[PDB]
Amino acid sequence: MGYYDIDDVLADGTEFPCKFQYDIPGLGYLENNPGRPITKNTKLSLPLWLARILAIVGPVPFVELLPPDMFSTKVMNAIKTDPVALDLHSINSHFFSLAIKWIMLFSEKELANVVSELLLQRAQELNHHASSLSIDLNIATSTFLLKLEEMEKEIYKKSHESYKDTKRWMFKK
Amino acid sequence: YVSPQQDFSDLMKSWKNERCSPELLPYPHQLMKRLLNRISMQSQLIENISMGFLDMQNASNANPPMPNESKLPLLCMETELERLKFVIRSYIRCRLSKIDKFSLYLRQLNEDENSLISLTDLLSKDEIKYHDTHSLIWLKLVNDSILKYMPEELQAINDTEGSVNMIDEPDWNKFVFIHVNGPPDGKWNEDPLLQENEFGKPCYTVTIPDLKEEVELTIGSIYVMRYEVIRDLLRDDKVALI
Amino acid sequence: SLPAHLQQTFSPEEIQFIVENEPIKIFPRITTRQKITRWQLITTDDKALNNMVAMRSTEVVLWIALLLKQQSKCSIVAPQWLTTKELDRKIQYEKTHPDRFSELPWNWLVLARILFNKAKDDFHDPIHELRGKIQDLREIRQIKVLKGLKYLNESHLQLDNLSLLEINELRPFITEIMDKLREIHTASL
Amino acid sequence: MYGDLGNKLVLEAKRTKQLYARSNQDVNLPMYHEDIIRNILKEVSNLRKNTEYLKEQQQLGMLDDKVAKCQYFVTLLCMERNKRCLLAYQRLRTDILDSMAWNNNGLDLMSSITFSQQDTNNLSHQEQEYLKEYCDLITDLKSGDLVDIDLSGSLVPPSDVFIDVRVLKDAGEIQTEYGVFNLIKDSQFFVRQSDVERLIQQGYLQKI
Amino acid sequence: FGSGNVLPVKIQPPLLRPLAYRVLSRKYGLSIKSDGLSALAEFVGTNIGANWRQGPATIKFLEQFAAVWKQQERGLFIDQSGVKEVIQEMKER
């Protein structure tokens, strides 16, 4: 609920599938069809700042939210099998924010049990890669930091900076 | 009171609590006044000795202040004043930043009739002037830039009924590091909250209602805990933010 | 305050400040006893500094001791835990109990670094041996911290004897991970 | 659709934040985005016209109410989204300006001598005005009850009484309390830290 | 800024620079140059009679000298123009 947060604003503009449950004229720029009015039982991808509200006001609301592609059974199975190796960036750049949003709109205890485990298992690798300060006298870090969500990069940067400052102060001669 | 060491201890504990806390802590009105008066007198004192040493030197080409038992005391005065001024400066600027972050929330608190929290206690007078001036300047900027081209239905910078709440409030469940000091002064039997445990020193008890559990904090241990369940202990100096 | 992060975490220099705001023992090389200019400090008790006699043990705040040792008017005595015997006892205690932290003072790393930098002559043991022992302790403490990081949740954690610098270098990761876990749990209620 | 342009603006803000985040030294804000902002202004004006038209077309009673409610909600939501994007961009730029204003020891910034961190023409006119009143607010703070403490002073703790400094730029003799410093270029000084904090902050001295 | 005192006693700037430094360099403004400091000796010596132990007079003089430098853009270093700005100050009154 951060009004001025940039990342929340960006993540809140993603497109979700949905179906119109009524028949209404005057629309159509949603379909990029200006003059054509929208019919009943039409499936379109609408942005989240619109689909969230259109599914509340009606009783039956005007629009029904359809299951997303990023929360399918395949993605859950891939998360469960191997959390660290999975490329969450390819799935979506804002996986976690949309995950808590989806849990909030629709109370789903199963998703809350999977996302928590995924985050907990990826935190260990994040700490391992953040603590590795190079000494002057690997492919793993470059490979892993390309699989990081938008939220996880902030934590990586903070941890890395703190470790470097601590090491710098310890060995200042 | 009437101890200059305890004033410095209290200032340090207030600064340490201020940096790590999410909310805007109450202002220690008396302590700041005493410290500012002490600084004002001390600066005059060092100035007085400096002038006295300088004036006599030029009169009859006399010797400078004889080096033994002379330089080190005054050097210590200067460095001690420098450290104290730094501590107070950091405290003030940190609380000013926190004031900047929560302008609308403070305004709503002040505008509410049935609110025990009042800005005359939580905010210093200079901080009140800062808040009032900054709010007006920011409102002028946003009104001239964007809000003028908007429908009358939505022209308010504070809207609690819109799609997203425009008033941000402090995070009341932030995770913090705490140390259990125990009683502020002593008399462990006097404190009613203290309760003994098995083969151990007395431990405080708190409850987490969302989790619905009871957590015991033993004295002398460091904990990572929610901020809300520990507000009373921190207010009563039983725990200290590290 | 605002610039260069500093919003919710202390810098190493501020930790050093807090450490130097703590007392230490010295052997004065000068006598400033009153006869039968004075210090008159405002944040620390000046009774010991005013009444000083040579070749006797007194205690003052740390930064005054460093300022005096900058001149030739002081000699700081290192704490008793800065010895090879007392460090080897703690190493053994650290080895035997793999699920608790040893009881070291909350400023051992900062104090060790400061004393090695400033008062190198005052130590009785060779300094390289102590410097090796400090690293030996730090590595094992790091192993225990790495093992303990696995038990992160939404309720609370207990880190009984972790040092100040160790807490500072780990705070941003721990706090944010538990905060995100707490939001995920709260959302499902 | 309607708000798809404003997202671009938000994206730009993100990039600026990175320059703010990855900043070893102070940086300058990029160019203003008055053209994109004017485009959102035009589209929100068109949305206002559409809302008006819906108002008349409903109040003549040719259309069902349930039908009109949907487009009313859509227009309202699009305007709210555009307002959110514009306000977020403005607040980020305002925060960076406040940080710079604090990090120049108060003063009037662009009118007087500046540290050359920022060009005049990057900022908008309203931003230029805002900066002026914010600097005046800092100034009359510094003359408040906290005169003895320099609220615009250094924020790194003092831990070294005597320091070695080197002059970067040539200058003349400067009087200090109880003495004089002669700023001959390529010369080294061994002096107390308190005397030279001001000169180090203004770029006439190096090292600490 | 006033006249009619006993006579303009001459004193060295060494006994004048601490007050000017504390008022200007520390709080607001800076760079009191040596030549500028010598220039600022004459006008304060014009009314020198029974001063350096007095109350507001010197502080108000330094305040008024700061007023020009807030008003005019000027610069940092104080040069032989220091009398030129006091001419402007007496023009103002």
Alpha carbon E35 to its chain's center: 13
Q: Do B168 and A3 touch (CB under 8 A)?
A: yes
Q: In angstroms, rounded to a whole number, what is the distance separating the alpha carbons of residues A28 and B215? A: 57
Residue type, B134: H
The last residue of a domain, from among D138, D154, D170: D154
DSSP 8-state secondary structure symbol assigned to residue C34: P
Question: Do D143 and D165 fall within a single domain?
Answer: no
Residues of E in contact with B55 (CB under 8 A): 15
Integer Cα distance of A133 and A148 in angstroms: 19
Domain extents in chain B: 2-168, 169-241
Regarding whether D207 and D140 lie in a shared domain, the answer is no
In chain B, residues with a C-beta closer than 8 Å to the C-beta of D127 are: 141
Residues 6+ apart with CB under 8 A from D92: A4, A6, D13, D16, D17
- Dihedrals φ, ψ of B130, to 5°? -60, -50
Contact at CB, C158 and B223, closer than 8 angstroms: yes
β partners of residue D189: D165
Identity of residue B181: N
Strands C157-158, B222-226: parallel, antiparallel or unpaired by DSSP?
A: antiparallel
Task: List all residues 6 or more positions away from C96 whose beta carbon is below 8 Å from its beta carbon.
Answer: none
SS (HEC) of E42-54 = HHHHHCCCCCCCC
Question: What is d(CA C107, CA C161) in angstroms, rounded to the nearest whole number?
Answer: 11
- Touch criterion met for E and C (3+ Cβ pairs within 8 Å): no
Report which DSSP code applies to C81: T
D105 and D162 within one domain: no
**D149 reaches C (C-beta below 8 A):** no
* Chain D residues close to A30, C-beta within 8 Å: 1
Task: Judge contact between A94 and A10, C-beta under 8 A.
Answer: yes
Measured between beta carbons, the chain A residues lying within 8 angstroms of B165 are 1, 3
Asked if A49 has any chain B CB less than 8 Å from its own CB, the reply is: yes
Residue that is written with structure tokens 């979700």 in the block = A16
Q: Domain B2-168, what architecture?
A: Up-down Bundle (1.20)
Residue B13: HSE in the Cβ half-sphere, 13 Å Cα cutoff: 19
Q: How many domains in chain D?
A: 2
- Cα(D23)–Cα(D96) distance, rounded to whole angstroms? 12
Q: Are the C-beta atoms of residues B204 and B194 closer than 8 Å to each other?
A: yes
Burial of C152 (0-12, 13-18, 19+ CB in 10 A): middle
Interface test with D, best of C5, C10, C13, C61 (most D CBs within 10 A): C13
Contact (Cβ atoms closer than 8 angstroms) between residue D191 and residue D200: no
* CB D44 within 8 Å of CB D79: yes
φ, ψ of residue B218 to 5 degrees: the values are: -85, 145
* DSSP string covering B14-30: HHHHHHH-SS-PPP-HH
Q: What is the DSSP string of A143-155?
A: HHHTT--HHHHHH
**Are the beta carbons of D76 and B153 closer than 8 angstroms?**
yes
d(CA E35, CA E81): 10
CA pair distance A161, D189, nearest whole angstrom: 33
DSSP string, chain E: -----S------GGGTHHHHIIIIIIIS----BHHHHHHHHHHHHHT-TT-SSSSSHHHHHHHHHHHHHHHS---S---TTHHHHHHHHHHH-
Question: Structural domain of residue D76, as residue ranges?
Answer: 1-154
CA–CA separation, C107 and C129 (whole Å): 20
Q: Which of B179, B200, B203 is nearest to B191 (CA)?
A: B203
Tokens at C101, concatenated: 């932290």
Q: Is B126 in contact with D145 (Cβ distance < 8 A)?
A: yes
- Count CB atoms within 10 A of the CB of residue B17: 18
Neighbours of chain D (3+ CB pairs under 8 A): A, B, C, E
Q: Are residues D11 and D114 in the same domain?
A: yes
Whether B163 and A1 lie within 8 Å, measured CB to CB:
no
For chain D, the distance separating the N- and C-terminal CA atoms, rounded to the nearest angstrom, is: 56
The first and second tokens of residue D66, run together, are 């349930």
Q: By the 8 A CB rule, do C165 and B158 touch?
A: no
Q: How far apart are alpha carbons A41 and A19 in whole angstroms?
A: 6
> Do the chains contact at A120 and C13, CB–CB below 8 Å?
no
Bridge partners, D190 (sequence order): D164
* E vs A contact (3+ beta-carbon pairs below 8 A): no
The residue of E76, E79, E80 whose CB has the most chain D CBs within 10 angstroms, and thus the best one to mutate to test that interface, is E76
- 3-state SS, one letter per residue, for A76-139: HHHHHHCCCCCCHHHHCCCHHHHHHHHHHHCCCHHHHHHHHHHHHHHHHHHHHHHHCCCCCCCH
Burial of E6 (0-12, 13-18, 19+ CB in 10 A): exposed
Which residues of chain E are within 8 Å of residue B51 when distances are taken between CB atoms?
Answer: 18
Please give the structure tokens belonging to residue A151: 């939220």
Indicate whether D173 and D106 sit together in one domain. no
Q: Is B58 on the interface with E (CB under 8 A)?
A: yes
Q: Decide if D131 contacts D99 (C-beta within 8 A).
A: no
CB C7 within 8 A of CB B97: yes
Cβ <8 Å between C158 and B221: yes
How many other C-beta atoms are found inside a 10 Å radius of the C-beta of residue E59? 13
Instruction: Tell me the C-alpha distance between C76 and C114, whole Å.
Output: 12
Q: Which chains pack against B, by 3+ Cβ pairs within 8 A?
A: A, C, D, E
Q: Are residues D129 and D199 in the same domain?
A: no
DSSP three-state, residue D5: helix
DSSP calls for B82-144: HHHHHHHHHHHHHHHHHHHHTHHHHHHHHH-SS-S--HHHHS-HHHHHHHHHHHHHHHHHHHH
CA distance to A172, B204, D49, per residue, from B108 (Å): 48, 35, 34
Q: What is the resolution of this structure in A?
A: 3.4
Determination technique used: cryo-EM
Reduced to 3 states (helix: H, G, I; strand: E, B; else coil), residue C91 is: helix
Chains that touch E (3 or more CB pairs under 8 A): B, D
- Read out DSSP for D139-206? HHHHTSS--SS-TTS--S----SEEEEEE-S---EEEETTEEEE--TT-EEEEETTTTHHHHHTTSEE
- In the stretch 63-122 of chain C, residues with CB closer than 8 A to chain B read 63-64, 67-68, 71, 73
Are the beta carbons of D28 and D119 closer than 8 angstroms? yes
Determine contact, residues E76/D113, Cβ cutoff 8 Å: yes
Kindly report the nearest CA distance between residue C69 and chain D, in angstroms.
13
Q: Are residues D46 and D94 in the same domain?
A: yes
- For D11-51, give the DSSP string: HHHHHHHHHHHS-SS--------HHHHHHHHHHHHHHHHHH
Q: CA–CA distance from A9 to each of A2, A54, E67 (Å)?
A: 9, 18, 48
3-state secondary structure of D171: coil
Mutation target for A interface from B138, B161, B168: give the one with most A CBs within 10 A: B168
**How far apart, in whole angstroms, are the C-alpha atoms of residue A62 and residue A44?**
13
Kindly report the nearest CA distance between residue E76 and chain D, in angstroms. Answer: 8
Q: Are strands C23-26 and C58-61 parallel, antiparallel or unpaired?
A: antiparallel
Same-domain pairing of D136 and D167:
no
**Per the CB < 8 Å rule, is A120 touching C169?**
no
Which of D14, D70, D71 is best to mutate for the A interface (most A CBs within 10 A)?
Answer: D70
Nearest to C184 among A112, A130, A163 (CB): A112
The structure tokens listed for C159 are: 């880190």
Residue C116, CB-side half-sphere exposure with 13 Å CA sphere: 21
CB B78 within 8 A of CB D162: no
CA distance A158 to A151: 11
- CA-CA distance, B122 to B127, in Å (whole number)? 10
Q: Do D105 and D75 belong together in one domain?
A: yes
How far apart CA B29 and CA B32 sit, in angstroms, is 6
Distance CA B207, CA D185 (A): 66
Q: Residue D63 corresponds to which amino acid?
A: L
Chain C positions in Cβ-Cβ contact with residue A155 (cut-off 8 Å): 172-173, 176-177
Taking the alpha carbons at both ends of chain A, their separation in whole angstroms is: 46
DSSP state of C150: T
On whether the CB atoms of residues B215 and B206 are closer than 8 A, the answer is: yes
Token digits of residue E42: 């004459």
Please give the Cα distance from B135 to D115 (Å, whole number): 28
Which tokens sit at A72? 């399918």
Residues after which chain A is discontinuous, using a C–N cutoff of 2.5 Å: 58, 137
User: Could you report how far apart the first and last alpha carbons of chain C are, in Å?
Assistant: 37
The token pair that represents A101 in the structure block: 């949003």
Report the candidate in D111, D107, D127 with the shortest Cα–Cα distance to residue D32: D127
| Residue C97, Cβ density class (10 Å: 0-12 exposed, 13-18 middle, ≥19 buried) | exposed
Let me know: does B156 contact D87? Beta carbons within 8 Å. Answer: no
| D112 CB-near residues (< 8 Å, 6+ apart) | E73
D85 and chain A in contact, CB less than 8 A = yes
Question: DSSP alpha helices (H): ranges in chain C?
Answer: 12-20, 47-50, 62-70, 84-96, 108-118, 127-148, 164-187
The residues, ordered by sequence, that sit 6+ positions from B211 with a Cβ below 8 Å of its Cβ are C154, C155
Spatial separation of the C-alpha atoms in residues C24 and C47, rounded to whole Å: 15
Chains A and B touch (3+ CB pairs under 8 A): yes
Instruction: Chain C: give the shortest CA distance to residue A158, in Å.
Output: 7
Residue D87 touches chain A, beta carbons under 8 Å: yes
Torsion over CA: C176, C177, C178, C182 (sign): positive
Q: Which residues of A touch D (CB under 8 A)?
A: 3-7, 9-10, 13, 22, 24-27, 29-30, 32, 47, 49-50, 53-54, 57, 62, 157
* Breaks after residues in chain C, judged by C–N over 2.5 Å: 36
**DSSP reduced 3-state for B216:** strand
Q: How far is CA D4 from CA A10, A46, A47, B148, D205, in A?
A: 11, 12, 10, 22, 50
Task: Give the CA-trace dihedral at B212, B218, B222, B223, to 10 degrees.
Answer: 0
Residues in chain A closer than 8 A to D67 (CB atoms): 24-26
Tally A–D CB contacts below 8 A: 52
Beta carbons within 8 Å of D171's beta carbon, 6+ residues apart:
D183, D204, E77
Cα B96 versus chain centre, distance: 10
Furthest-apart CA pair in chain C: how many Å? 78
β-strand B213-218 against B222-226: which pairing, if any?
unpaired
Residues in chain C: 189
Considering CB atoms only, which of A2, A49, A53 is closest to B168?
A2
The type of residue at C58 is T
Contact by Cβ (8 Å): E31, E25 = yes
**Distance from the D154 Cα atom to the nearest Cα atom in chain C, whole angstroms:** 10
Find the length of chain B.
242
- Which subunits sit against A, judged by 3+ Cβ pairs under 8 A? B, C, D
Task: Identify the bridge partners of residue D179 per DSSP, sorted by sequence position.
Answer: D176
Which phi and psi (to 5°) does residue C177 adopt? -60, -45
With an 8 Å Cβ cutoff, is D155 touching chain C?
yes
Q: Which two tokens stand for residue B239?
A: 């725990």
The answer for residues whose C-beta is within 8 angstroms of residue D31's C-beta and 6 or more apart is D122
Distance from CA of A159 to the nearest CA of B (A): 17
3-state secondary structure A29-76: CCCCCCCCCECCCCEEEEEHHHHHHHCCCCCCCCEEECCCCCCCHHHH
**Strand arrangement of the beta sheet that strand D205-206 belongs to:** D188-192, D162-167, D205-206
Residue pair B227/B22 in contact (Cβ under 8 Å)? The answer is yes
Distances (CA, A) of B183 to B37, B180, B192, C89: 30, 9, 10, 33
Rounded Cα distance between E70 and E63, Å, is 10
D143 and D198 inside one domain? no
Helix (H) or strand (E) holding D125: helix D125-142
- The residues, ordered by sequence, that sit 6+ positions from E11 with a Cβ below 8 Å of its Cβ are E41, E45, E48
Mutate which: E11, E15, E19, E53, vs B, most B CBs within 10 A: E15
Q: How many CB pairs under 8 A join B and E?
A: 6
